[PDB]
């Protein structure tokens, strides 16, 4: 949850992890905490339709301007529809859900656009695995600043993609972990409490400060 994420971020940030005499960032690495999902591609068509995105497992989703969300699974037929009040429906495109046909068409447009024009983030990352019987998250909300796009997934994860240098953070409050993707596309997953104890480089530290500000904002607009 956001409240938990805020506590976790406040704790590591208050410890001033980059203002230590010797930094041992490597000691905070925990590959067992790598996220299952993150946003790999996105398109902002919120001028007219909404925000379309791809998850790392190749599923696609859209957060429509009317606050409903639709997800198309990587098998290309399965659907999960989330209504304004959070009601979830599991359907198939092949079944021809009458009320959803226009939304399905828009989603396929997004899927095709992203596949033809956009680079998959975390292409070199292998997500962890857990269950499978019920587990695809949808986009709860998002916003953009002059510096980044902030994506909040229904599984509690918060992702921040920085525009200027292509660096990215994937924060998970369940694992209390952060995955940092650097400008070279190299990545690491760190336990936040271990960064507090062992320190980290400026850069990750500055991005974690920014993340806290973004989380406070998400909580303010709750």
């Amino acid at each position: 949850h956001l409240s938990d994420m805020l506590q976790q971020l406040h704790s590591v940030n208050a410890s001033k992890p980059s203002e230590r005499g010797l930094v041992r960032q490597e000691e905070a690495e925990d590959p067992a905490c790598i996220p299952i999902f993150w946003v790999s591609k996105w398109v902002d068509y919120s001028d007219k339709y909404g925000l379309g995105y791809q998850l790392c497992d190749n599923s696609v989703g859209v957060l429509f301007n009317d606050s409903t969300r639709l997800i198309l699974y990587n098998d290309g037929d399965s659907l999960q529809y989330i209504e304004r009040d959070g009601t979830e429906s599991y359907l198939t495109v092949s079944s021809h859900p009458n009320s959803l046909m226009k939304k399905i068409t828009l989603l396929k447009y997004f899927r095709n656009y992203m596949s033809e024009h956009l680079l998959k983030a975390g292409a070199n990352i292998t997500p962890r695995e857990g269950d499978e019987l019920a587990r695809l998250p949808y986009l709860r909300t998002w916003f953009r600043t002059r510096s980044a796009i902030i994506l909040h997934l229904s599984n509690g994860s918060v992702q921040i993609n920085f525009f200027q240098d292509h660096t990215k953070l994937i924060l998970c409050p369940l694992m209390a972990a952060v995955t940092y993707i650097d400008e070279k596309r190299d990545f690491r997953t760190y336990r936040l409490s271990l960064l507090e104890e062992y320190g980290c480089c400026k850069e990750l530290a500055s991005r974690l400060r920014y993340a806290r500000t973004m989380v406070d904002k998400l909580l303010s607009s709750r």
Binding site: V43, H117, F163
Partner: peptide, 7 residues
């Protein structure tokens, strides 16, 4: 940008 990083 109105889209994520191009191919």
């Amino acid at each position: 940008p109105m889209q994520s990083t191009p191919l």
